[PDB]
Structure formats: structure tokens, C-alpha cells
Symmetry: C3
Subunit: 285 residues, 3 copies
């Protein structure tokens, strides 16, 4: 279970991190599969390997520790999680919750998150951006909600509302920023459903998910968003459609993480630009 | 906690039987903000969970109580302090109290909860008698019964036919109508959201389209255990919120306690 | 329980290889009341799970049965591992990965399922052509945890999980042997169980596009697919799902077993005739 994402352990982590950077992040960023470029476009960046943060959850790419990247992006102080924690890997809820709660204590007000997702909605094209305006947390509706277990009152209430989980204003900004910069056509809003994974969704599953009103499906993001909303961090989340969900069993096309990565590699640049440009126009600061 | 097997349950029940001579025929579980009923129990014996060895324990200030006594002439055991899965309680922990009830002699379990209203015909404060449920966690491999079956209590694969006893439902409705609040009472399908997050509009829309009428984070697990060991079940949701479907878009507590008393009043007796 | 990693799976496969010379190319898993196939295995060696170190235990003890079925080398799991029993992912995964290491190329699985699809009759066979892994979607996918690279990829696709050629072959065999009318193809949804499905659940599952519902199969199929074993799977419809909450009709396990046992011989025949027509090099 790693370390309990309670106030004491989170504070310890936050304070260790604070000793390692003068950057007080206003904006937290989680990069999805193949969506790292943004990470590297951080200016005046301090890079802190997860291995170098005591009690911070560990995730390697393959042997390599993920990184916490502090710096600025469009003149805003950010912390970027380079390497997220997917539940299908077996990570505990505390493992996934901790980094977000650390972000909260560090000063993060807005969490921006990307993921690679399958396009269920038939109108989606590979490489489309689907801003999450809502989600369906299949694991959470089951008994696998990241918040299951004693509530950490320090961070939030027992029964978080997920009413405006995907801040409608952030979404409006994101869309406008896409519109103004010539790629509004790539931008949709929709419902992301979490498949715990790690299997890609069968055609029957995709068909069911689509009929449930899901637009994109992936294996991440919702738990982080839940933790985020729980502790009052505003969320903006986008899915890169990295595969068009196959709805027919009588089909050649088979999802594969490689093509997901390829699609991510191809759209990483535009998504980075989009993110930098959204960040530039974030209010309150 | 401790496996809700016949031996561990037998022990907790035997302890309790040393603490009271009330043999309940009716078990009552009150939901969120309900349970203004535990007050109206006559000649009650309040037994704090803390006092019972191996009994699951509730949650600052308000520790749990097993309230024994009489309601509308009938012997009851009320659970003041309910155990929700989102709290991280084990299957055994949630099953044990229900099986203890069984050993203590409970024949009918009456359950109330606070639920979100999915069905668009529902209004705040409506009562939705459960006539069926969708056990999302159960289908998704978090069925309270997962693990070695405790054969002493019930069969490996319990059917959930008539799980919400139709006769009890008929009676509950008749009593509501006879008491001038029949118009508040609906019947419908309760779906369990493991929680503890409230349901997103997308989730509610999906739940509605799944044929769900109300959603909450309790009840089904207890009901499963009750049905498993042959306890008849009556269960009702107080609609305490009307679910929002699109992102782009005390009074009752005592009425319910009254309703329960009046139902119990009319419950058949051997 | 031991991790279904390559080391543990090898150890088991080797210990089994010390007890039998039969290199199985076909793995068979029998469902509720359907183990009549285990009897038809010729030149057979029966290896109680108990006789296998670190092999999952289930019950009399379960058996790995090695031998010949329609001239093809098979290994049959007499006694499978159901998640509703409390078994770990590793417990379910390991036997399938052991089969992989023993040389299994095709996994044929049966199960007893509730018939959701309203055109299904009791005792029908519904060949699985796809599945809805409700536990899987809900974060109880058997593969959750470190990926075992020796066996498979981190994110297995499940597109042709129910090998369409095996399905075609299964249907032709049924058709030519007089019981094609018994045979359907459909979507199996896993109810984690062990409760039978409520009428509202059944109604929901049906509307989700599910034809049959059971509490097994998907996890082994997923592990099989993950390690590149080809899968054929069939639900025996051992009960017609009750969608009506006012109905007196209800599932009864004794009836489920009876219905399965009644059909086991035909199913055995079918599996044998399928295996007989499997292409061989
Ligand atoms: O969600 P992200 O991290 O982007 O990654 C997604 O893509 C991967 C498989 O394609 C899974 O990890 C899924 O969750
Ligand atoms: O179901 P009861 O016990 O009514 O409580 C319900 O209300 C709480 C949330 O408002 C959750 O615990 C939910 O299950
Ligand atoms: O799937 P098989 O193994 O056939 O068995 C099924 O039959 C039982 C339910 O009747 C459960 O065990 C279910 O999994």
C-alpha cells in the first residue's frame, strides 16, 4: 500500500520536495502515454527523480524512475509528474493519491492531466483531443474507488461531489485556446470511462461503454481526478484518442500500445502547444 | 476482522445473549440521517458495539449501538452504526452483524438508506421501496460473499429471487397508503455505488439507463447476507438528492420511522 | 499463493513434466457439471493438484488430466478456480501459464451460464465470441499487477480473443453432427458472483449486449490470450435468466448442475469432434 496518503506522510514528502526546489507550483500536470514532450518544455526546470523523494511512490519506465519536474510554463509555476501510476500496475490507492495530495500541499491549484484513450464515440478520429467534461468511474462504482478506506479528513470530505469535476471554465478556456489557434476541429468534449485494465476493451465492452454514453475509454486519470477534486484542486483533463475502439468482433484491427505511443508521439507537439497556451491564459494569476 | 463463520458469529451472538434476553424477530438498519427510530423502541437495551467482543466497530464520538427492545409490540434489534464498504470494512465485517442477527432470531431485516434519485419521476423526500437491486460491486468481483462459503449460513450460490420480499413490499405500501403518505412511496431498483464519491452526471445517466431507480453506497451487501442466511428483507430508500444527469445542465426521517413502526405493527407473527 | 511469474510457472511445469511425458497441445477446462470429458481421455495420467508443488488447490482434490483426446495431446483441468471462492489472480493465472509452458496451443473452456438472450433455450450451447469483463473494467482484471513479460504484453488486445476459426469449426462440427440448432454464439459477461444475478441485473446485462452470464472463464481466457494461447469457449445455458422480479422462476444451483450434467456427454462429444478436426502439422 506504500505509505498512507494521510496528512503526516504527505507533509513529509511535500517538505522534502520543498527543500529541493524554490518552485511553488500553481499548476500540476500529469502526462499520459506518449505525451511527455510538455515535460521537457518546462523552463528553469528542476528535475526530481521519484527515487530521490522519500516515501514518494515509485514507477519506472523500465528501470528508470519517473520524475517530478518543477519550473515554469508560459510564465506559470508548474510541477509536472513525468510518470504516472496506473492502477492496473497494482499500485495502491495511497500510491496514486499521494502525489496529488503532495501537489495540494505544495500549492497546486489546478491539475492538468492528459491520457491516451480509445475513441468510443464514432465521431472521433485518431489524434483527436477529447476534453473530459465528465467521467464514468467503473472501478469506483464497483468497490474500487480510489477513496475507499478511511477518509483523510485533512484533504477532503468523506463523500466528495464530482459535480463540476472537470472545471467547466477550464474546459471553456481549453476549447477557446484550441479554437483561436486553429485546431478547434481536433477538439471535442466527452465522457471518459475508466477501464481498470490492463486489457484493451473487447468489442462487446466498447459497445457497452459507448451505449452507456462513454466517448473515450482508458485506464488512468479518474482516480487522480477523484483525489484532485477531493482536495479541492480544479481539474482539466484531456484524452488523446490514440485508437479508435473496435466495436465489431469480426475485425482485423487490434489495439496495441505501440500505435498508442505512435499517435502520442505525433500529437505530443500540438498537445504541448495547446497546454502551454492554456496555461498562459489561466486566470487568478 | 474475524471470519463471519458460524463459530465466530455464534460467539458474538452468545455474548450478546448474555447482555439481553430480548430475542429480536426483526432487525433494523437505519441509513444516513435516518434512525430517528432507535428512539421509539420501548424498554430498549442499548448495547454499544464497543461492548461486544468481535463485533465490528464503527467513527468519532458516535460509536455504534445494537439497540434491543420492542417496537409496535414486536421484538427488534436496531443497528445504530452501520458499516459501509467505502470505509474499507471487510466483507466479514459487514456480514457478521447480519449473521449475528440471524442467530439472535431475526426473521425480517428492515433497511433504510438515503439514496440519489435517478428515476426522473422521483422527487426529494420520496420513499423508494427496493424491489430489486443492481450490485455493481458484486458483478465486478466485490460481492460481499466472495470467499469460502459459510455453509452454516447459506448456500454457495444464493439466488436473489424475491430478495426484496414482495409481501413485505405489499404490506409496506398498504401501510403507507393507509397512513396518508402512499403518494410518497415508489418501488424501484437500487444500485450500489461502491463510493464514497457521489455519482457523476454521466454515471447517473448510465445508472438510469441500466434500469436503476436510486443509487447509494449501502444496503445491497447486507441484503445479500440476509438473503444468504434466509432473513426476509424489506428495504427503502429516502431520496435525499435528485441526481443531476448532465454536467452541462428530519420530516421524512420521522415519517419513515413512523412507517417502519406501522409496518412492524402489521408484520405477521407466529 | 505464488506469483504466476515465469520462475514459479516453470517450476510447476517442470514438476509436472516429471510426472508425465504427454506434451499437451490442447488445454481443456470443464465447467459446472461438465467434467464428463475428463473421462474420455485415453492413455491418461491423472495428477491430483495436491501432487503438484505450488499448484493452486481446489476440490475431492482437483486433477490435471494428461492424455489423448481424438488423437490429440490434451491436458484437462478437472476442477477450476473461481474468483468468487476468494482465489487470487495468481491462482487462476498460474494453471493457464503452466499449460502454456507444457506446450498448450489451444485452450478450450466450458462453463455453465445463465441465458440472458431471450432466444436461448435451456441446455443450449453459446459459443463465446466475445466477453464483457465486468470485474476487469472495474479494476479486478486478472492481469492487474506487474506484467509478466515472459508471458505476454502489458496491454493485451482482446480483439479475436475467441478465435474465430475455432468458433467456425465448432459450429460446423455441431451442424454436421445434428446439434447445430443447439448452438449459438454470443457475448459472455462475468458476474463475479457467487450470487446469481438479480432480475434487474439480468435485465441490465442483457441491455448491455450480453447473451450469457457466468462467474468464470473470462479471467482464464484473458491469461490464455495474454500468453498467446488460442481460445475456444462455450457456455452451456444451465438456466434461463429471470429478468422479471415478479417471477417465481429462480436459478437453483442443483438445477444448474443437473442441466450441465445432462448436457455433458453431448458437450464432450462436441469437444472431441472439434479436437478431431483441429488442423495438425
Ligand atoms: O492513460 P495513460 O496514462 O495515458 O495511458 C493509457 O494508455 C495506456 C495503454 O494504451 C494505458 O496506460 C492507458 O491508461
Ligand atoms: O446508505 P446510507 O446508509 O443511507 O448512507 C448513504 O449516504 C451516504 C452518503 O450521503 C453514504 O454512506 C450512502 O450509502
Ligand atoms: O463457470 P463454471 O465453472 O461453469 O461454473 C459456474 O457455475 C456456478 C454457478 O451456477 C459458478 O461456479 C459459475 O462459475
Amino acid at each position: 500500500e506504500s505509505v498512507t496518503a494521510n496528512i503526516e506522510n504527505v507533509k513529509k514528502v511535500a517538505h522534502h520536495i520543498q527543500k529541493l526546489t524554490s518552485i511553488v507550483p500553481e499548476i500540476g500536470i500529469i502526462c499520459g502515454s506518449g505525451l511527455g514532450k510538455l515535460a521537457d518544455g518546462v523552463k528553469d526546470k528542476i528535475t526530481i527523480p521519484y527515487t530521490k523523494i522519500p516515501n514518494f511512490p515509485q514507477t519506472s519506465v523500465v528501470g528508470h524512475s519517473g520524475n517530478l519536474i518543477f519550473g515554469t510554463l508560459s510564465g506559470r509555476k508548474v510541477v509536472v509528474m513525468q510518470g504516472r501510476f496506473h492502477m492496473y500496475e497494482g499500485y495502491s490507492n495511497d500510491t496514486v493519491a499521494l502525489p496529488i495530495r503532495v501537489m495540494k500541499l505544495l500549492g497546486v491549484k489546478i491539475l492538468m492531466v492528459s491520457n491516451a484513450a480509445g475513441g468510443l464515440n464514432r465521431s472521433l478520429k485518431l489524434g483527436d483531443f477529447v476534453i473530459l467534461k465528465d467521467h464514468i468511474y467503473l472501478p469506483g462504482l464497483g468497490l474500487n474507488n480510489i477513496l475507499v478506506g478511511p477518509n483523510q479528513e485533512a484533504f477532503g470530505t468523506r463523500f466528495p461531489a464530482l459535480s463540476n469535476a472537470y472545471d467547466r471554465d477550464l474546459r471553456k478556456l481549453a476549447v477557446q485556446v484550441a479554437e483561436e489557434n486553429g485546431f478547434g476541429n481536433l477538439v471535442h468534449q466527452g465522457v471518459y470511462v475508466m477501464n481498470g485494465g490492463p486489457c484493451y476493451e473487447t468489442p462487446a465492452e466498447c459497445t457497452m461503454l459507448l451505449n452507456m454514453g462513454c466517448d473515450v475509454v482508458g485506464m488512468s486519470t479518474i482516480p487522480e481526478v477523484v483525489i484532485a477534486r477531493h482536495c479541492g484542486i480544479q481539474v482539466f483533463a484531456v484524452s488523446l484518442v490514440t485508437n479508435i475502439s473496435v466495436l465489431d468482433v469480426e475485425s482485423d484491427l487490434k489495439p496495441n500500445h505501440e500505435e498508442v505511443l505512435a499517435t502520442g508521439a505525433q500529437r505530443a507537439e500540438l498537445m504541448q502547444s495547446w497546454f502551454e497556451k492554456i496555461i498562459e491564459k489561466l486566470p487568478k494569476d
